[PDB]
RNA sequence: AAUUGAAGAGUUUGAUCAUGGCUCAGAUUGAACGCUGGCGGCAGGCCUAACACAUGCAAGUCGAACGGUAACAGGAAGAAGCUUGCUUCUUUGCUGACGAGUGGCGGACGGGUGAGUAAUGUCUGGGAAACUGCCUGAUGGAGGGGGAUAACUACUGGAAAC
RNA sequence: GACACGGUCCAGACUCCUACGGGAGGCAGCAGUGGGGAAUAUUGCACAAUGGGCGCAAGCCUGAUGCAGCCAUGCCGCGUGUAUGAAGAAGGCCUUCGGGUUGUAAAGUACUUUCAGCGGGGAGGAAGGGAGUAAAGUUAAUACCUUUGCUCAUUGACGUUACCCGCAGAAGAAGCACCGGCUAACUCCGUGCCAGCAGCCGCGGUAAUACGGAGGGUGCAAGCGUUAAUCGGAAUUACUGGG
RNA sequence: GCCCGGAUAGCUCAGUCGGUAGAGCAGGGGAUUGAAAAUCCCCGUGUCCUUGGUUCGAUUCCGAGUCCGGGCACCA
């Protein structure tokens, strides 16, 4: 089953998250088919905090992919309305 | 470090005076408070063939680290001085205020005289029952008559009054007199290694009886011995294969160490308190040599005679530097010499050792100074 | 990483004044200069090929008080830049925080300038920064922390800057004691008594 | 805006030019040793024996599948001390939950090693004669019966395992 | 879906329990021990975060992971203070015994205080979830369930954190190789082809810039040298680019 | 922890059932030569590992300690 989850990168005591699309039977930083945007929870109070490429994501859910809890929280964080 | 010893009479309070110095000096200075049980019931140790009954007590002082020896029996004090099983320097004269100087207390001053025990710091015990200023001066006067006759200056030896029972419980009003007792000792954690093991899956298992300090699992500890000194950390204390976290003095328990192979720790080492003791290879001692029929020799030896010193866990050989005037030490002598060791090890003015050569008894001594 | 020693033996080694001991005296003179590099410094130099490359290489490092590894790192960082690598050098080396403080006049000497940057008294853009090797961004202000501003030392340092050059790639306020920055330092605007020609060659081999 | 890039010397010989090896000048390391050694940040830390192993631990979960409930905590009926509801407290699956058992799902993931392997492998580019739990799109269905077994009792083999 | 690391049956080997009939086991999973070896660390903490398994969910397991401890193993930042200071001292050393040099170095004096040690403030990593409630869907229903706002109590292993403020006093913090040419930087004394040096050419035979020490200077810096190993130099395997 | 064998001038060993320690290979001090060789003139430099006893007298007799090499333990 294809899933849309996160990927812990960056460094110790300074995380980073490059949200990707991979399989549930793989590693966290394992093999994936496509990555779609990222997430920086500890970046800074600046113009850029999180980039989510929604269009490609909706393209995967229609196939039958299930979204993760933290990932879906970002979808509401992007605020579909505004 | 300087080793002291409570010389006196039965029912005087020598064991509670020994318990007085070790407990309150461990609360305001450092060390470990000792229970009354271990000071009374001393363990048995075979010293050169004859079994002795002594208790080695230690406490920390701001300047040095003073030791303390205490025997429960009068018969054990005969062997303690005339031969020198438990090396002692500042012999604490314990005289009761209720009874006063009695024949057994008088003998210990003469027994220390003929041998060579230089310092005697007198502490008058059991003064919490009698309250009479004229009586305080009368018992103090019988003591001054008991030291002048044995070549000891009674005008410079300090006299400290007190009671050791409440000095053990915790009443602060009497504790100031115990501190000046140890203060007058200035003017006038440690763990001996007896056995070593190594079980499959844990590492190095060291066994020995604790003389001073409290052991926690996970603390930094140092190792001092005649070989190359190293550093380690406590990773476990076990007794009869049963877990015991709080390791107290007197307990002959087994300890687990961190990252050491079996070939680095042997018989003669000491688990000491971090950054508190330096090694010595040069010190001084005054010995006694016994007769052939009683174990020792019958002929004297020369200068350069290097016997084996067995100090609390060792069998280290040391070269002897005989003083001027002393050429041949014949059996029965109570003379001195300067001792030079071949290995760097913690040598204090009072650590006890048996002297053997030929695989048997030769003599025993009293460590007086560290040069 | 600094020298922290008899830091005037360096001036006698090359002869050129390094200004490491500017201080309260106009010209040093109490150093017996030009004729005492060492005890056997009376013997005339050989001036070898490897040496001519070396003698100015160490000299610039003795001026900036920079570690050789740090010098080599700045070398290759200058290698991956646009234009002349030799010119790329002095721009970045003039970018070191305490050196700009030295050009501002807030630091009597470079040693005094770095002793201030290390003690959190210096402040850039309202931020306390402690790294001496902080590359200054184009056109920014640098000042002193308020609770440690003008505490008898930098006070004496303000009179010293009056007799200095005060370059044209920056601007010092001296009223509130603000060290503002302008366009990147040009090679023709500096002391111009140093030759970077030979420095690029020593790391070429 | 995106590879702005290349150094030599010594040594054969009385001396020279050659051919010609040898050596050093640099960078690097999964490093070791000698010596010394203040703090911090980020990485790496069994290369030899794919040698043998103590002990704890490293994959279990679901009562919204079922029979049960051996325990824990309530309810409920009751029982006894006795302050007449203050308590003691024996039955009860009636609930919350839950050992052991049945069943479903995972255990093929994640983790480690590099022994084997010279092409049954890997990498590169294509391909057709396949399968595809879990998730998802679409069209329908989801009717009716029986026979056993573990748990659990009784007896019982076996040191244990079983 | 395995022809299966923490499954089964069988054989062999290495161990183990044994009531001797018969059974049990697999750290090349986290640690850890023996041994091997020139050489490589704790039987740590928490499921807060990501992810994986089950379950509607709540939760539960999670040596995956996230951190901590340990080692200078490497890279990178930083500190061991700065200014002033000439009788241009003592002492060391050399010496044409004049003096020079170590040397503004130190002492003395005036200031400052990162990181440490001590005592208090204090982020973020946290998104959710549990209970309550409004509305809208759904329905016979204001119910149940779902979704979207909101309220409440909160959930952090690291953690005596990051970072910031304050106190005290220059206070706690510098070595390593080298010094004839290659290749930056020297003399003296002692030892006399002896002791030893060494990458190569080579030095030492009683006047050694090369041995050992001393002083001085030189290179680098919490690293410095040495050894092992690859490439480069090597156009000494030359396609680029030789005969 | 316990039990044996080597611990003998630079090195390898002989000598013992008490009697003031040898040999070999060495090596070296001098004449000669710029220096060695060859030749010639002459040689032990020893704590018998350390220490002690039974002493007219111990390397050897009985013992121990420590270093090295060689065998077994014990398992908080
Ligand atoms: N009143 C009084 N009695 C004492 C004091 N010290 C010791 N004792 C008593 O003396 C008795 C025995 O003393 P202890 O110390 O066992 O003597 P030892 O073991 O022969 O040294 C105990 O019962 C104590 O109560 C004291 O200072 N005051
Ligand atoms: C191990 O059991 C030690 N704690 C106690 C001990 C017993 C016997 C012999 C030696 C030590």
UniProtKB/TrEMBL annotation, chain B:
Keyword Cytoplasm: yes
Annotated binding of Mg(2+), by residue: 15
Molecular function via GO: GTP binding; GTPase activity; guanosine tetraphosphate binding; magnesium ion binding; translation elongation factor activity
UniProt xrefs under Gene3D superfamilies: P-loop containing nucleotide triphosphate hydrolases, Translation factors
Record-linked HAMAP family: EF_Tu_B
Enzyme type, top EC level: hydrolase
Protein source organism: Escherichia coli
Entry keyword annotation includes Oxidoreductase: no
Name of the protein in question: Elongation factor Tu
PANTHER family per UniProt: ELONGATION FACTOR TU, MITOCHONDRIAL (PTHR43721:SF22), ELONGATION FACTOR TU-RELATED (PTHR43721)
Underlying gene: tuf
Assembly: Monomer. Heterotetramer composed of two EF-Ts.EF-Tu dimer complexes.
Family, as annotated: Belongs to the TRAFAC class translation factor GTPase superfamily. Classic translation factor GTPase family. EF-Tu/EF-1A subfamily.
A cellular-component GO term for this protein: cytosol
Record: residues binding GTP: 8-15, 70-74, 125-128
Entry-linked NCBIfam families: EF-Tu, PRK00049.1, PRK12735.1, PRK12736.1, small_GTP
EC number of the protein: 3.6.5.3
Protein location: Cell inner membrane; Cytoplasm
Domain Tr-type G stretches: 1-188
Catalyses which reaction(s): GTP + H2O = GDP + phosphate + H(+)
């Amino acid at each position: 089953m294809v899933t849309i989850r996160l990927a812990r990168h960056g460094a110790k005591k300074r995380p980073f998250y490059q949200v990707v699309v991979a399989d549930s039977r793989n590693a966290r930083n394992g093999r994936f088919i496509e990555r779609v945007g990222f997430f920086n929870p500890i970046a800074s109070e600046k113009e850029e905090g999180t980039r989510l490429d929604l269009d490609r994501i909706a393209h995967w859910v229609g196939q039958g992919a299930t979204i993760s809890d933290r990932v879906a929280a970002l979808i509401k964080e992007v605020n579909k309305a505004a | 470090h300087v080793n002291v010893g409570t010389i006196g009479h039965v029912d005087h309070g020598k064991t509670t005076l020994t318990a007085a110095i070790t407990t309150v000096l461990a609360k305001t200075y450092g060390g470990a408070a000792r229970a009354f049980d271990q000071i009374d019931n001393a363990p048995e140790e075979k010293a050169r063939g004859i079994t002795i009954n002594t208790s080695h007590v230690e406490y920390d002082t701001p300047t040095r680290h003073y030791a303390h020896v205490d025997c429960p029996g009068h018969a054990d004090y005969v062997k303690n001085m005339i031969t020198g099983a438990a090396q002692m320097d500042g012999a604490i004269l314990v005289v009761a205020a209720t009874d006063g100087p009695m024949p057994q207390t008088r003998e210990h001053i003469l027994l220390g005289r003929q041998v060579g025990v230089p310092y005697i710091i007198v502490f008058l015990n059991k003064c919490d029952m009698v309250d009479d200023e004229e009586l305080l001066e009368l018992v103090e006067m019988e003591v001054r008559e008991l030291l002048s006759q044995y070549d000891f200056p009674g005008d410079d030896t300090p006299i400290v009054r007190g009671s050791a029972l409440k000095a053990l419980e915790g009443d602060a009003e009497w504790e100031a007199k115990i501190l000046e007792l140890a203060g007058f000792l200035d003017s006038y954690f440690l763990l001996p290694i007896e056995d070593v093991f190594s079980i499959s899956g844990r590492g190095t298992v060291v066994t020995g009886r604790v003389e001073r300090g409290i052991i926690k699992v996970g603390e930094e500890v140092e190792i001092v011995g005649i070989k190359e000194t190293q550093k380690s950390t406590c990773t476990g204390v076990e007794m009869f294969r049963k877990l015991l976290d709080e390791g107290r003095a007197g307990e002959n328990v087994g300890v687990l160490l961190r990252g050491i192979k079996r070939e680095e720790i042997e018989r003669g080492q000491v688990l000491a308190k971090p950054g508190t003791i330096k090694p010595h290879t040069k010190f001084e001692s005054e010995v006694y040599i016994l007769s052939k029929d009683e174990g020792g020799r019958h002929t004297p030896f020369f200068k350069g005679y290097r016997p084996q010193f067995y100090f609390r866990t060792t069998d280290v050989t040391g070269t002897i530097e005989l003083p001027e005037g002393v050429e041949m030490v014949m059996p029965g002598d109570n003379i001195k010499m300067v001792v030079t060791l071949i290995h760097p090890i913690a040598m204090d003015d009072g650590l006890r050792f048996a002297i053997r050569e030929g695989g048997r008894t030769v003599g025993a001594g009293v460590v007086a100074k560290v040069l | 990483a600094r020298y922290l020693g008899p830091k005037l033996k360096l001036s006698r080694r090359e002869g050129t004044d390094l200004f490491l001991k500017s201080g309260v005296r106009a010209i040093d003179t109490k150093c017996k200069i030009e004729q005492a590099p060492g005890q056997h410094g009376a013997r005339k130099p050989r001036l070898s090929d490897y040496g001519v490359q070396l003698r100015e290489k160490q000299k610039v490092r003795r001026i900036y008080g920079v570690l050789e590894r740090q010098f080599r790192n700045y070398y290759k960082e200058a290698a991956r830049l646009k234009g002349n690598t030799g010119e790329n050098l002095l721009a970045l080396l003039e970018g070191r925080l305490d050196n700009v403080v030295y050009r501002m006049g807030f630091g009597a000497t470079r040693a005094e300038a770095r002793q201030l940057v290390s003690h959190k008294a210096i402040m850039v853009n309202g931020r306390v920064v402690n790294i001496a090797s902080y590359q200054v961004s184009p056109n920014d202000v640098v000042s002193i922390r308020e609770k440690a501003k003008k505490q008898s030392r930098v006070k004496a340092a303000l009179e010293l800057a009056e007799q200095r050059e005060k370059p044209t790639w920056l601007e010092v306020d001296a009223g509130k004691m603000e060290g503002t920055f302008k366009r990147k330092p040009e090679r023709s605007d500096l002391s111009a008594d140093i030759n970077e020609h030979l420095i690029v060659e020593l790391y070429s081999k």
